[PDB]
Design a protein around this ligand. Structure first.
Ligand code: SFG
Ligand code: SFG
Lengths: 8, 343, 343, 9
């Protein structure tokens, strides 16, 4: 998508 | 190629742009559960790498190829389609592994490889396992795989379970209900109330939660990466029949996934379960526009359907009913556009 | 069209998809300073609207066209290129205004109007004023404006000023030093540290800040929307000479903006300055990778050069020097990929 | 960009 993996 | 038939060219550009950033490779890399588990999987199954040929699908920084190298593999083709491939090549040089790791820039659907490999390794899991459609690239890559050669990960388990969380439901409901105002700066917005509820409830919720919110043992859907064809993931049908263990409102289904590295020496599992330490995948919840009331002892049955789309994601439909009352909920979710709620 | 000429098809697609979300319209609508000030500017200048013909460029939900209606306008053409136009239409019907507001689905560079207008209203301000390149669309719409017609807003002022924020600066290296590890799971990541630094420095920082970081009074760059042409915004050169009010290390420039609605009854301002209550525009900071020491009384001169690109944004080039010492710094930033730092 | 308008409190 627009941000396929987001921050941890 | 198989890839661009699958994919809106536009989607592919943006996708690979995102993985082009060092900050994003860092974000994945510093997920210690993920990175350390992959390392354990590979290192502990050293015989599956010792003097073998290896393919790394989407090598990113190269971190997984470096692991394969540490485990004593002869040659490792490290395929990467973003501009991160340049940076990976720098690292192979600075780590003096030019004789063992070969960066091959390009999509794994499109590049040529000098020989067949004994094993394929990748980290192609998205949110809810299937986001990004990378699993289809990983499966595609088996055209380079030798007979009785291995996949790492080997299998993936998607888990789903009904949950209750009124605070989450209300939070999304309250946002939608902005569009129920009859006199916002004097303007009647209320005719859009329905459209708003639709849009907000379309977004899956990515974050973590306590297992106490779950109302029934999970149902499992398994994909065997050794055996599956990439066309198997075009239409994913997951029937479910939950035996409810608590009474209350069901506000949706929660999802997570595990993968297993079925090594020659041992199997190693990487789990994104809510019972397990947190990873950058969190967990995923699909809310029902109207929750369903259930008694302990009821059965909640229906189907979760994932239709693969050309933006490298899935249109999700979830139809559920409480058998004892015929109370039903049908929902359509856009997996590409989640609400990242965490913190 | 003029629009498709300067815009990559894929950038346009993403852009109007974003604005096609009720949630994103809502986010703007809920900015009280924004929405409240627009309403006040229109209503308090009722003579500029009473029985007039209006063009609302990029009407979104309709909200500004409802305000024009509230002030007594006879006919309001509401142009909107996203699928939000269909929602705007629903609201016009449901507010019983179909003979006074006409929703026209499409790009203002491509549609037709059935007549010329007395006044054009829009909210096309991006962060740093210019992001999105929608001011060009507002200016392009002047082809529909009667001689001596008006524009709301009438003028835009961009403010620039030097700041010191040692922590913001140092945080970039903190983040980048992730890569300065000789054995991250056994891998020497060091060689990418410089690239990681460069990546972080290319992102303008969107958040707010305490005005005490500012080391000199702002210089402003003004755009008169009555007089400017579209092409005036393809290359925006902002010279500066700051008289330093405070000694210290200058780490970059801060950006904000104001617009004025110059009506017949009054002039009303909308400010996004750090001295005013917060808006969804926050403020913008562009760092220097090398900071400059100055002392109160010195002069910091240079140029901020904004070069439009085809993804509806600008390439930012900033060059500055402390005159008395000739110490100099130069920086390149990607306005379309900001770091959204806030909370 | 991806998110041209920023989310407000
Ligand atoms: N079809 C493809 N061909 C080549 N690379 C791909 C493809 N699809 C995704 N990728 C890359 O695969 C990577 C997916 C990452 N999650 C894995 C990065 C790296 N292996 C790591 O474990 O840190 C990204 O770098 C993508 O750019
Ligand atoms: N060239 C264009 N033609 C038509 N509409 C546009 C164009 N460029 C941007 N827009 C729309 O203009 C709107 C800009 C919004 N900032 C404002 C929405 C609304 N006027 C409000 O003030 O709440 C978005 O809905 C865009 O989709």
């Amino acid at each position: 998508g627009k941000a396929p993996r987001k921050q941890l | 190629s198989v890839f661009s038939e699958r994919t809106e060219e536009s989607s592919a550009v943006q996708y690979f742009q995102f993985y082009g950033y060092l900050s994003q490779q860092q974000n994945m890399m510093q997920d210690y559960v993920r990175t350390g588990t992959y390392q354990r999987a590979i290192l502990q199954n050293h015989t599956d790498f010792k003097d073998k040929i290896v393919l790394d699908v989407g090598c990113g920084s190269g971190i997984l190829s470096f692991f394969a190298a540490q485990a004593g593999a002869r040659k490792i083709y490290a395929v990467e389609a973003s501009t991160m491939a340049q940076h990976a090549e720098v690292l192979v040089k600075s780590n003096n592994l030019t004789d063992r790791i070969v960066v091959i820039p390009g999509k794994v659907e499109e590049v040529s490889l000098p020989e067949q490999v004994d094993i394929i390794i990748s980290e192609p899991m998205g949110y809810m396992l299937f986001n990004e459609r990378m699993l289809e690239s990983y499966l595609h890559a088996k055209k380079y795989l030798k007979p009785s050669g291995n996949m790492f990960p080997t299998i993936g388990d998607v888990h789903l379970a009904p949950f209750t969380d009124e605070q989450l439901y209300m939070e999304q409901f309250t946002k939608a209900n902005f569009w129920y105002q009859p006199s916002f700066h004097g303007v009647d917005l209320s005719a859009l109330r329905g459209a708003a509820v639709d849009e907000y409830f379309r977004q899956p919720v990515v974050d973590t939660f306590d297992i106490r919110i779950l109302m029934a043992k999970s149902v499992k859907y398994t994909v065997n990466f050794l055996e599956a064809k990439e066309g198997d993931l075009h239409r994913i049908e997951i029937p479910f029949k939950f035996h409810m263990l608590h009474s209350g409102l069901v506000h949706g289904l929660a999802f997570w996934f595990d993968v297993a590295f079925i090594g020659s020496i041992m199997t190693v599992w990487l789990s994104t379960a809510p019972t397990e330490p947190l990873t950058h995948w969190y967990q995923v919840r699909c809310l029902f526009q109207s929750p369903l009331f259930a008694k302990a002892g009821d059965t909640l049955s229906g189907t979760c359907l994932l239709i693969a789309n050309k933006r490298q994601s899935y249109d999700i439909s979830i139809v559920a009913q409480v058998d004892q009352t015929g109370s039903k909920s049908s929902n359509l979710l856009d997996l590409k556009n989640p609400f990242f709620r965490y913190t």
